[PDB]
Each structure stands twice: as C-alpha cells, then as structure tokens.
Design a protein around this ligand. Structure first.
Ligand SMILES: Nc1nc(=O)c2nc(CNc3ccc(C(=O)N[C@@H](CCC(=O)O)C(=O)O)cc3)cnc2[nH]1
Ligand SMILES: [Ca+2]
Ligand SMILES: [Cl-]
Ligand SMILES: [Cl-]
Ligand SMILES: [Cl-]
Length: 159
C-alpha cells in the first residue's frame, strides 16, 4: 500500500519560496512516528530541504537528473521508486508537490497535519475530494511553548 504524509497550512499550502514559517517539533515527531522503518519516497527539492538522509528509513529520491549523494537511492520513474521499495506493507510518499501529484491516484491512505497558518504558498498539496476519503483518526493541538501554531493530525483512508 502507498501512503502520503504531508503538512498542510490553510488552502493546502505545503511549501514556500523559503523555509516554512513555523516551528512544529510535535509535527516532526508525528512524521517520524509514521515513517520510521518504512521506505520513504521524495523529490529532489524535499531532499535538499531535509539536508541529509532521514534516519532509520530507506530514502528514495525520485529525479530525472543523476544523483549527488551516495547515502540514498536515486530513481528516475515512479515505477522505479516503487520497485526500489521491495516487498513492504506500506510505502510512504513524503513530497513535495509534484511527487504527491504523481502518487495520489495510487495512494490508499493520507496522513495529514493541518496547520492553522495563513501563508502564501509556492506549492500545494493536491486538491483531494474529502468526500472520497474516510477520516479514521483526528487529534487537535493548540500552539504551546515548543510549537508555534495550532495543528491537527488526521489519518484518512480511501473510501
Ligand atoms: N507531517 C509532516 N510534517 C512535515 O513537515 C513534513 N515535511 C515533509 C518534508 N520535510 C521534512 C523536513 C524535515 C524532516 C525531519 O527533520 N524529520 C525528522 C524529525 C525532526 C527532528 O528530529 O528534529 C525525522 O527523523 O523524521 C522531515 C521532513 C514531508 N512530509 C511532512 N509531513
Ligand atoms: Ca471517522
Ligand atoms: Cl506523534
Ligand atoms: Cl520535491
Ligand atoms: Cl470522514
């Protein structure tokens, strides 16, 4: 099964010209909880953003240009990325925009963090029909001493 995991500000904003203007360690901990020991597929901009390989996960980078880091796997097609995951119960697609776009139609599950931030987006999560999805988990949190905005965790399963 393929799943997508994303953090969405208002209007589905997922990325900006520069680093996103929030500080959400609790969301990064949710991200880790749901990706640890699973293969993760990402595009090159997201790979650059993260800075290094995500620990304890097989990192696959989907890209048309040859790779510039030997500590991860570089693939040139969606089907190559999937094959590189081998035989695992769940593949996690971690962005960014174009990669979500490409994997959405194949995905059966979404792990979304909705962040209460009004920002002008450079890239957006795909316009999914919430109509077509079943929320099986939701959990709301206010901003606190460590987290700058209010956010809500959701898991959704393809109806
Ligand atoms: N829920 C969610 N939040 C994210 O911000 C997110 N970000 C991207 C890509 N960006 C990033 C940026 C950093 C890390 C990261 O540093 N994760 C660490 C935990 C952070 C820490 O320990 O300081 C990890 O080990 O997973 C992951 C994804 C894709 N899906 C997401 N999904
Ligand atoms: Ca429900
Ligand atoms: Cl968590
Ligand atoms: Cl990307
Ligand atoms: Cl629902």
């Amino acid at each position: 099964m393929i799943s997508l995991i994303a953090a969405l500000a208002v209007d589905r904003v997922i990325g900006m010209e520069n680093a996103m203007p929030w500080n959400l360690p609790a969301d990064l901990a949710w991200f880790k909880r749901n990706t640890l020991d699973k293969p993760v597929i990402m595009g090159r901009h997201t790979w650059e953003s993260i800075g290094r390989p995500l620990p304890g996960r097989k990192n696959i980078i989907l890209s048309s240009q040859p790779g510039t880091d030997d500590r991860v796997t570089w693939v040139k097609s969606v089907d190559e990325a999937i094959a590189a995951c081998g035989d695992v119960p769940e593949i996690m697609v971690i962005g960014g925009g174009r990669v979500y776009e490409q994997f959405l139609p194949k995905a059966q599950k979404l792990y979304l963090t909705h962040i209460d931030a009004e920002v002008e987006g450079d890239t957006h999560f795909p316009d999914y029909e919430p109509d077509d999805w079943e929320s099986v988990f939701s959990e709301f949190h206010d901003a606190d001493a460590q987290n700058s905005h209010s956010y809500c965790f959701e898991i959704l399963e393809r109806r």
